[PDB]
Amino acid sequence: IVGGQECKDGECPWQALLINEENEGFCGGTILSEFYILTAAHCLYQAKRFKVRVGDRNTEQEEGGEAVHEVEVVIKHNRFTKETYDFDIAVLRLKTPITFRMNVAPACLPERDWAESTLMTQKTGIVSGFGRTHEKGRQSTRLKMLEVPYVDRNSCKLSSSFIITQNMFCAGYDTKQEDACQGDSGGPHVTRFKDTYFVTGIVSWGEGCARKGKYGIYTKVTAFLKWIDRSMKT
Amino acid sequence: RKLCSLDNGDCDQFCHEEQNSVVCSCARGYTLADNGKACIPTGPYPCGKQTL
Ligand SMILES: C[C@@H](C(=O)N1CCOCC1)N1CC[C@H](NS(=O)(=O)c2n[nH]c(-c3ccc(Cl)s3)n2)C1=O
Ligand SMILES: [Ca+2]
Question: What CATH number corresponds to the domain at position A54?
Answer without folding.
Answer: 2.40.10.10
